[PDB]
Swiss-Prot record, chain A:
Gene name per UniProt: AHP1
Name used for this protein in its record: Peroxiredoxin AHP1
Reactions this protein catalyses: a hydroperoxide + [thioredoxin]-dithiol = an alcohol + [thioredoxin]-disulfide + H2O
Listed GO CC annotations: mitochondrion; peroxisome
Domain Thioredoxin, chain residue ranges per copy: 6-173
Amino acid sequence: GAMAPLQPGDSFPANVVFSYIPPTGSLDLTVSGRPIEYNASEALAKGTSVLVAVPGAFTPTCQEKHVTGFIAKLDQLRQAGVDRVLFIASNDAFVMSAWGKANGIKDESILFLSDSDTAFSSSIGWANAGRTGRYAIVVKDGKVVYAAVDTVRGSTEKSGVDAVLTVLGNQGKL
Amino acid sequence: MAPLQPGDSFPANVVFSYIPPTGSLDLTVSGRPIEYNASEALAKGTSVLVAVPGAFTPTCQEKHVTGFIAKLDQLRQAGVDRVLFIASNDAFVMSAWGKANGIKDESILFLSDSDTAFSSSIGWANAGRTGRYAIVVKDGKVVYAAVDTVRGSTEKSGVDAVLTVLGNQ
């Protein structure tokens, strides 16, 4: 789309929304919830945000390596100044909510949201055939600091937690 | 497109994608999808095929699948040999949905109707999701088929509807 590609120095695009079921402190997978709209453009205009897209909830690489790496380093991400971590995929809000609960996330440390119809991912050119790509975006006070996509199957070289922590460290405010 | 009717043969060449249960309920461990030959499975015995609009969605979770789980023994007393839940969600999501509901074995299988291929072929899909419907088969012959068009209702596809039609057999 017109936003494609996102590059450092760009503002995060306007009018970006995701659908999600807010966490409640409970990990009960049989409580489905009720989706609401998350205004990502407003949220990302203040503070430091990490936005990670994965091709699919509950799929092997996304589960076994990608999301678990971020979960293991949530203390380091917080100490590096990250105010919010967002995981998106094309799966609907109900599936994304179950995926976060399956990974033990009961609070706002990581939100799990749906990029409905890959609207956002397609706008920045990183979607295919109904699924988002695997990518990571770091934003600070509305400004894209980092945006990279993993095109190699099974790799998190560019969108994994280590790449994000490296970017944060190069900002010079540790 | 006329629907599946009692007395019709169950359609040929119906296949789903699914991850075979292992006995583990760990949702962070996934297996490898394989094909499930539903036409062959349904050619013998009594089978119940239930389509839901989405794994983990409120009616499907809180009312629909839980009813079949709670009354599994009643279904077996009526001679039910297979219970299959399908949706357009991929096999990884369907596998996790089965585990979320505590199903460790093949008593209820959770399979993907990839691209709503089967549901579309019988006129019960829309916009990338299957409808909410149930099909009861005995030895390859449909004995019941109906779809729920009222949001939130399992009147036509819920376990009570299935138990009733089996009780009239």
